[PDB]
Design a binder for these strands. Structure first.
Ligand SMILES: [Mg+2]
Ligand SMILES: [Mg+2]
Ligand SMILES: [Mg+2]
Ligand SMILES: [Mg+2]
Ligand SMILES: [Mg+2]
Ligand SMILES: [Mg+2]
Ligand SMILES: [Mg+2]
Ligand SMILES: [Mg+2]
Ligand SMILES: [Mg+2]
Ligand SMILES: [Mg+2]
Ligand SMILES: [Mg+2]
Ligand SMILES: [Mg+2]
Ligand SMILES: [Mg+2]
Ligand SMILES: [Mg+2]
Ligand SMILES: [Mg+2]
Ligand SMILES: [Mg+2]
Ligand SMILES: [Mg+2]
Ligand SMILES: [Mg+2]
Ligand SMILES: [Mg+2]
Ligand SMILES: [Mg+2]
Ligand SMILES: [Mg+2]
Ligand SMILES: [Mg+2]
Ligand SMILES: [Mg+2]
Ligand SMILES: [Mg+2]
Ligand SMILES: [Mg+2]
Ligand SMILES: [Mg+2]
Ligand SMILES: [Mg+2]
Ligand SMILES: [Mg+2]
Ligand SMILES: [Mg+2]
Ligand SMILES: [Mg+2]
Ligand SMILES: [Mg+2]
Ligand SMILES: [Mg+2]
Ligand SMILES: [Mg+2]
Ligand SMILES: [Mg+2]
Ligand SMILES: [Mg+2]
Ligand SMILES: [Mg+2]
Ligand SMILES: [Mg+2]
Ligand SMILES: [Mg+2]
Ligand SMILES: [Mg+2]
Ligand SMILES: [Mg+2]
Ligand SMILES: [Mg+2]
Lengths: 87, 70, 116, 101
RNA sequence: GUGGGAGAGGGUGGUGGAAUUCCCGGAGUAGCGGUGAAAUGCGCAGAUACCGGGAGGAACGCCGAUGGCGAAGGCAGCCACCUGGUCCACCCGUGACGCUGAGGCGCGAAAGCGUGGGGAGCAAACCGGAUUAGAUACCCGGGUAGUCCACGCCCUAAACGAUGCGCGCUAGGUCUCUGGGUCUCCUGGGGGCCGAAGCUAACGCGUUAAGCGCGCCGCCUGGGGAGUACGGCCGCAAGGC
């Protein structure tokens, strides 16, 4: 699974300032963690479909948040994409 | 014809090792009794069922009995 | 050629016939009887009267081995499953315990079309 | 890692030497998969509701462990390999949900 | 975000008992089976009924619900692992990041196709027995594909709530599943049944709209010919759009 601890480290990493939880950044990062977990889980268990739909949905969300960042602050976006290894 | 829960004290519904109490929820045969007979809740009954099934696999409670008299 | 005394009685009753098997405490049969054991041929085998006659025949046959007590075990639903037990009671065999052992599955096998 | 309960039902025919041996193997395998032992209850000889391996009785060992979750099924496989062990059930622990409080 | 929750939601591996069939053994004889009646069939190479042992496949009784989960198809023994969705509380973070969605891609009951396994029970086709004017059927005795597993195809359906998705608004009562609460009851999120206003051709619908509205997609334009022909695309084929 994803421990509270792992999650926390991810957030205190991607926080924009102490106490930041729900930023576009932190959200995208969290999503990314969940994405990688799922894909690794779908390498074996290829026949798990319903889960895969879950993944489609996650990916969709991630892309929308990124699209938002892209529009608003292109710098924060570039930084995120580099830091996380995406798009 | 009272209800099973009616006569009993505090008891763990998740405890599959306790036969003494679990046996009270079974039938003349091995059957798990209806809620009407157990006087249980939806959730309660749902838990009892799985706990009993555990005890059956575990060798403590019967899957079936034979009907006497008749 | 046994002298079994105390014993076990099995009534297997279907809609098409009734058959009664008398055995010893270990369960090995002594004698048996059925609707066809006696004169009956067709549907008349699954008659309750037939079942009476069969139970009786088996009980007398077992009287030959000198049975006294018996333990009744009833499998199946069928016409005159009861009449079997009834005749078996007044058969002079003193009936200790009656029991219903009819097998039922936890859903193993798809039934015949007539049975679904 | 995570908290489980190990149920073990073995041959009631055992003397003390062999019982202690089988138990010694249970322990060895437990600590060999990384399973720490919180609490143990030995209930022992009990009358089964149905015959198991032709026996009306069974001898019960109950353990409560903290073990790596990726190792649990291997652990249980290990306990089953033994001849004398006729039942193994390992269960994730649960808070004691109760009725008639 | 944090802290709680319910669940046959999915995938992998294990595993438990009941039943059927078959095999081995014991005991035991003259029939069993089956029907409206029968017959075929099985049984003296010993069946049926009964007890003990073993092998194997398939499906999970009670619990079980007018219940639950899922986007749908669909999902129910027990255990562990891997994993999706979702609800509630707190009112903490971001600051419109929203809705819909032609094309695309993925999923998609059953039957069906391919390669290799497996095969207990059921069983299209088939072989028999009856019934009948005939019986190519209904009923009875057999039985192959198939049903099961893996991998790959197929893309259909009364795939039904015959009701596209989202948001706001418009009396209540009653039963129920699952959260939270000062747990009489209140308050969220599902499932149901009556009903206000209203709608409807009527039947009916009615805060789970078929009411009042806004947004976007799909779709219809008399019946038959016809889901046919032709062309294109997809399919190994059957065939599908
Ligand atoms: Mg007959
Ligand atoms: Mg073993
Ligand atoms: Mg949470
Ligand atoms: Mg499930
Ligand atoms: Mg034999
Ligand atoms: Mg012959
Ligand atoms: Mg012959
Ligand atoms: Mg012959
Ligand atoms: Mg047998
Ligand atoms: Mg075989
Ligand atoms: Mg039911
Ligand atoms: Mg879960
Ligand atoms: Mg989850
Ligand atoms: Mg705020
Ligand atoms: Mg601000
Ligand atoms: Mg959409
Ligand atoms: Mg399909
Ligand atoms: Mg299919
Ligand atoms: Mg095939
Ligand atoms: Mg094949
Ligand atoms: Mg047939
Ligand atoms: Mg024919
Ligand atoms: Mg003919
Ligand atoms: Mg006619
Ligand atoms: Mg057949
Ligand atoms: Mg073929
Ligand atoms: Mg349609
Ligand atoms: Mg419309
Ligand atoms: Mg409450
Ligand atoms: Mg739902
Ligand atoms: Mg409601
Ligand atoms: Mg209501
Ligand atoms: Mg109404
Ligand atoms: Mg509303
Ligand atoms: Mg609406
Ligand atoms: Mg026309
Ligand atoms: Mg067509
Ligand atoms: Mg043309
Ligand atoms: Mg064409
Ligand atoms: Mg072609
Ligand atoms: Mg066609």
């Amino acid at each position: 699974p994803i421990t509270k601890e792992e999650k926390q480290k991810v957030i205190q990493e991607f926080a924009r300032f102490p106490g930041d939880t729900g930023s576009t950044e932190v959200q995208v990062a969290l999503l990314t963690l969940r994405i990688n977990r799922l894909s690794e889980h779908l390498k074996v268990h290829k026949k798990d479909h319903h889960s895969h739909r879950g993944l489609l949905m996650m990916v969709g969300q991630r892309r929308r948040l990124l699209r938002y960042l892209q529009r608003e602050d292109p710098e924060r976006y570039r930084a995120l994409i580099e830091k996380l290894g995406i798009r | 014809k009272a209800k099973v829960k009616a006569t009993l004290g505090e008891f763990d519904l998740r405890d599959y090792r306790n036969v003494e109490v679990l046996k009270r929820f079974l039938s003349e045969t091995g059957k798990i009794l209806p809620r009407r007979r157990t006087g249980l809740s939806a959730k309660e009954q749902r838990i009892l069922a799985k706990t009993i099934k555990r005890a059956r696999i575990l060798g403590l409670l019967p899957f079936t009995e034979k009907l006497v008299r008749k | 050629k046994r002298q079994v005394a105390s014993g076990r009685a099995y009534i297997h009753a279907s809609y098409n016939n009734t058959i009664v098997t008398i055995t010893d405490p270990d369960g090995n049969p002594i004698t048996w009887s059925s609707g066809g054991v006696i004169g009956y041929k067709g549907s008349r085998k699954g008659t309750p009267y037939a079942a009476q006659l069969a139970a009786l025949d088996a009980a007398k046959k077992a009287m030959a081995y000198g049975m006294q007590s018996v333990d009744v075990i009833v499998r199946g639903t069928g016409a005159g499953r009861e009449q079997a037990i009834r005749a078996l009671q007044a058969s002079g065999l003193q009936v200790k315990s009656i029991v219903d052992d009819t097998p039922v599955p936890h859903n193993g096998c798809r039934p015949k079309k007539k049975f679904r | 890692m995570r908290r489980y309960e190990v149920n073990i039902v073995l041959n009631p025919n055992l003397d003390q030497s062999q019982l202690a041996l089988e138990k010694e193997i249970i322990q060895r395998a437990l600590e060999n998969y990384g399973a720490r032992v919180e609490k143990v209850e030995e209930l022992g000889l009990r009358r089964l509701a149905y015959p198991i391996a032709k026996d009306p009785q069974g001898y019960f060992l109950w353990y409560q462990v903290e073990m790596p979750e990726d190792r649990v099924n291997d652990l249980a496989r290990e306990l089953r390999i033994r001849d004398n062990v006729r039942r193994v059930m390992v269960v994730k622990s649960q808070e004691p949900f109760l009725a008639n409080a």
